Symmetry: D2
Subunit: 455 residues, 4 copies
């Protein structure tokens, strides 16, 4: 139901709240973009679960054994064998974080004019696909875009859609299939093993490569153990190893499920791709033997990935998120269902039904939540979706959401109650939330530093 933390607290950092009118000042100073608030002016920081995790005593012991050598570091060897063992891939190239590996994959595996197909888009991923000359095709099933629809494994690829893509475009014009676990923008929704196996069989028969976005693969494995028939007695590690046996490689932002504050990598089975990846890694990241990471960080990430395989750890991680979701839902607050692995997503269309999606309800709601509570959350809606690179119009995602994203091992159920209590009160006067409009818009990944003014 709701287990207690399967760990003790080793050290703490203080949290405080500043008055509402200070927060009012700060929200306008930040152009009503939560990304532009300062860390010290935030009481509970749920902007993202990326890089904000609490490390363990063992990882910190690893941090003291940083072998900082340029090549041949013990830390690189430990990371390399851990990832080979746990994920089952032949080769690994470390990168400083996820988008570093996406930069490598996209340059390596895409010829201009080709299609990349994925189970829903992601921001940095789609940007790197498109700047290397690819058209992104969404092949997640329709249901994944229906916020309130409570079905299991919403992250699953629609096989019918993949078949269609192959018939219409021809297999040789498909660069690869991008399969993310979990699917972040659908609300952290898992992909079933049955689906990964079917995708593999179908792509293999046409000679098409499959690369996983491994960023939240452990959360995903937890959902498989919990809900997919025949997996209830398998270990998280067994499930993780089987997942990747259906892929040709993966990108990974270790800043999520490897339980670290920095770090990532690219894996692949193909020797020639590994060669080419090492050539490129030196341009952007570092030598293949550290990839833009300190030795101590390769060590922390090797230790953290293995810790993530502990059943009680990942069960608690996921059920803590589910608790926040359960509380919000019992009070009538509209959310994406079912609750995903890493965050609760308020459905901004419903929270603010008096605004149109063109008035940026999600961006607005996130600002309002900050002003009323000091809790920081992130826009995951029309602003994040960016512009159509052909028409210049906003991409218009059906999912217009605001994310309360939970860092791993950082907060308690009492913090979840405080967050829930605040959101619930904002709900009582949701009609008070105003439309926003751009006053400054970056040319790509605009959500990061865009500024707004009230309409």
């Amino acid at each position: 139901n709701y287990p207690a933390e399967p760990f003790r607290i080793k050290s703490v950092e203080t949290v405080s709240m500043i008055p509402r009118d200070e927060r009012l000042k700060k929200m306008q100073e930040a152009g009503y973009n939560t990304f532009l608030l300062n860390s010290k002016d935030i009481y509970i920081d749920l902007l993202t679960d990326s890089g904000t995790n609490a490390m363990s005593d063992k990882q910190w012991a690893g941090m003291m054994m940083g072998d900082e050598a340029y090549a041949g570091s013990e830390n690189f060897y430990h990371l390399e064998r851990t990832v080979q063992e746990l994920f089952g891939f032949k080769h690994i190239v470390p990168t400083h974080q996820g988008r570093g590996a996406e930069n490598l994959l996209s340059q390596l595996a895409i010829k201009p004019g080709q299609y990349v197909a994925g189970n829903m888009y992601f921001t940095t991923t789609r940007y790197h696909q498109e700047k290397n000359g690819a058209v992104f095709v969404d092949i997640v099933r329709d249901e994944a875009h229906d916020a309130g629809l409570n079905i299991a494994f919403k992250g699953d690829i629609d096989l019918k859609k993949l078949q269609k893509l192959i018939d219409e475009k021809g297999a040789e014009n498909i660069a690869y299939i991008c399969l993310a676990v979990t699917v972040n923008l659908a609300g952290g929704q898992p992909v079933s093993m049955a689906n990964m196996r079917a995708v593999r069989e179908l792509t293999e028969a046409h000679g098409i490569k499959v690369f996983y976005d491994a960023t939240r693969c452990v959360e995903n494995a937890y959902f498989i153990k919990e809900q997919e028939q025949g997996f209830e007695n398998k270990s998280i590690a067994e499930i993780v190893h089987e997942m990747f046996s259906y892929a040709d490689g993966c990108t990974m932002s270790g800043k999520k499920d490897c339980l670290v504050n920095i770090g990532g990598f690219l894996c692949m089975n193909d020797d020639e791709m590994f060669s080419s990846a090492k050539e490129l890694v030196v341009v952007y990241e570092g030598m293949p033997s550290y990839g833009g990471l300190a030795g101590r960080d390769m060590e922390a990430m090797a230790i953290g990935l293995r810790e993530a395989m502990q059943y009680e750890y990942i069960e608690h991680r996921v059920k803590q998120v589910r608790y926040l979701g359960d509380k919000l839902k019992a009070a009538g607050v509209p959310i994406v269902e079912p609750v995903g692995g890493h965050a609760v997503f308020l459905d901004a269309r419903r929270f603010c039904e008096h605004l149109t999606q063109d008035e940026f309800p999600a961006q607005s709601l996130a600002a309002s939540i900050y002003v009323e509570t000091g809790v920081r959350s992130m826009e995951r809606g029309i602003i994040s979706a960016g512009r159509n690179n052909v028409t210049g119009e906003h991409h218009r995602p059906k999912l217009e959401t605001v994310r309360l994203t939970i860092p791993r091992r950082v907060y308690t159920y009492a913090h979840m109650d405080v967050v829930a209590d605040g959101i619930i009160k904002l709900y009582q006067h949701k009609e008070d939330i105003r439309g926003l409009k751009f006053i400054y818009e970056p040319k790509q990944l605009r959500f990061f530093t865009a500024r707004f003014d009230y309409i």
Copy 2:
């Protein structure tokens, strides 16, 4: 009612989640004595609040700045000015922990045959008084000995007993009044500011010295802020400083309210005594400027004592313990009342009223609690009382209790639920709890290494 943690987690400590059946085997291998359990086999360790506290990020930063010089360390000067500022004593001598400071005080301040009077007593404190030739006299209010009596400031000294001691023995034959805040043996009960002032004035008129056992002075200050009228507008720090203005000095276990794992100190206002204390500290502890502590530890203790002044921190510390007591009591589980600053004491006599004291109900209840929940608690009953080696009979204490002792900043309300729910479930079939018999009993310190089996 109960506040959320006024901090978040910076790092975690790894623990074992072994299941009940395996816990039963560890309990058996430990001869049903919780003092013999391995730390690595315990989920939640409530054996003691001494030196088991979680430090902050700021303390851990000070841990990296240990000036390890044998004399004149910068860390000692930081510690020194912090305690002068916050306690308002003229002089300070660091010691490795509390009983090191007690050793010094009792040697400095007692002539053979003299009396030391206090509000109840603690084992190490009273030991050092007696081996320097003092006779102990309990001058706590009589209410403190009624363990079920729910009244405020139960730790207060009975001014009439103090007067009576003075009239009967003479002021010149009283070494000092030892006033402890809070009072451990009464279950962590606080002492009021009015009481501290009344005692200062009576003792001062007769030339008698007063030394505080300041080990949980911050918990004590929280009770005064919360319950003593006139202190609603005072900061914890103002209250702490006023408390000590009524003393000639103090002994301190930093391992409790200074939020550290090791450390303590001795304070006094008198120049001549400070001189004598520096002559003696070098005998047992170290220099006046390290006192048996590493430089990093004087630094962590200087930083920890200042953090302990934060209202929200100590409010949450005391209310978290109170939460555990309230929950037990609402289900009819018998406890010492009112709940103290640092622990909850189960009344094992009443909990296991089908067992006689000779069947060690507290020792047996402590073993049951570990088996059922992974929680370690401390026996504080007939076993810890020891055996009269002259007559061979048990010392038979009036309190037959299990102590649930709460380290600062280590656990959450969900851990408190694990503890409460498990004890509550045992309470519902309390008649099934079995008596214990010795299978190995040493001559001394029997509570530390004795082994038992079920009757």
Copy 3:
């Protein structure tokens, strides 16, 4: 002559002391390529001064205060004001290390077909310039290419070459002047303040921008204090600030002169460029307020850059390298002159004049040095130069060298003796050094993984 270390040791790093016979086996298992040695098998690792620096106690304290927020981290603001104060640039964008900042600069500041001119070049820097469409032009003084010429400020730009470039191509077709301090490829040679000013004035009159590669700017400032007249009364910090007042911005590898294991940044004065840089940093690195670094690492870099301003620190850093060069040279061992800020380069062509370049004298000398002393050095000769894949011929560089690269604050003069004495002993029977032949050669990055055997 040579100052003592202006610091003492706070903690040590454990190394293997394996004997010569065992070192011969590790060298053989590594195919006689020092780049393939395991860090755990190396006594003294002079492969590189990049990211291998020892941090202080203060830096390690900042490592405990990482504010890991995704945006608005306190550590970023500390880094930001430190670089503004010390470099005197208006704006700063952090990057995970140097080549991340170079990626950004070259994309922001180059239109296809434009020229970038600099005092020699570095591989990553020049790569990013060229892939954004620039043509590189070397405008260093001709003396810089005479590797045995013992003159001051060998890194200076030839103003006449700059003028000639301007006259021939037009100012509008020059993207920027890339001025590096120190100049790595000339062996770590400094650039004078007069040169920096002369270049600022000529470029400014034509509207041309100047960006510094500031990677070893502090070593450079030490040379100006020591050798450029008029700077005897200036602090290292005054000199560093004046250097940058002659630039429009810079790229920085903190892994060199900021005394850290990871980290770098981009600076500029121009508001519009700062805006564009923040639009791009999110593509490859992270937010304008972490740039692909953990919060603790921005903190360590802010603290390290300020420590690097201490005169005694940088004096000792540069004179320790000089000590190694002086000792080699006094025994007749041929080196690049004068000795630079960060390394000594052995002339392997002259050292092994019984071998032809096709027998890889630098690669072989590097292997010998490890076998005889436990010291790892880097090949910087025909092997690192790579192979023309069009014609299949070696690129044949004029410099056939072994680089003895000195990390900051890691080694003592006795380690420098181990290195010198071992090289000196090899020099005395240099004729016994054997040529190498490939037994495995990859198509690219051949210096990283190639294996050899003796001829």
Copy 4:
């Protein structure tokens, strides 16, 4: 001859010097007692090698795995088995440092009226012997008191003197033999294995117990390997294990040869003594399961004791001291010979032959060395020797020395040169050093806080 450091520097702490007249001020403010100077006013701190050692990366990794439990800590178990394995004793009781264990031993093993016999006195040791009712008898051979006499194993007990003590006093009036390795006050002089074996045989035949002071046992083992015939091929660990096979237990200040900043212990073979020691440890130090130490400190000390067994580490440690000695001797500076394991001792009788021992030449010289160099050193002469507890006169040691004591793994040969250069210059005008007299004298261990004025 002089090996290089068999480790790299992992982190540093800054050192600086203040002007001579600031130092002049500071020396008089400190009553001309070097113990009373502040750490931050000292440039190179050679007061003592106790607790001032640099820890390794592995020890600091152990520091992150502090298991702070009150009983059953993993850290206590690791310390316990390491000491059982390496020293060979049956039982261990941790204490916060050396004099804590001496306090226990003296209370446990001495009946009033009995004699304790040792190879030369030590300050805290003799004080704890005498306050428990023992007469100290020196049975080191005469030669150990002759400063300039260069003979091997000066720490050896004179068997003739031990035999005499037994005949004159009777074996049952001898509490135990105290055998220290090395002998600190003779200048850090080693004891031979032959001598330890002869002492064991002779004491065993009379039923007399032998307890070692293990504080510098690893330095001692190094001297045996280097100089005692038949031990040249034994490992340091084998030699350490054999040493202790001749003892009934030991006291240990881990702050020396266990390479830590705090910590110690008491070992013994006898079960009944172990029982009694645990009873006493709770009075002064803590529970037998932590002994006044944080878990992380038991861990660091377990790791450090094992590191100390590495041949190259202890060889370098000892030869670095020998280098300082060689330099001083080549210049004609008078020292204790041969040079011991941990410090060079200037012979103050010879350095200041114009003063009498009653004018405290050693105390004076130490002050002078500070004023001229900023180097701190310690009095080891008439002041340290204390007063005869029968006559009230100063004990008058023949050895009137000033100690330049080297912390482990903290300084370099260049620091040793700076120290040597300074001492050598002070020597040129040694006639300038003035007599001192007490203005304040503590009643015991007076050297710690005594203050003086020039005669």
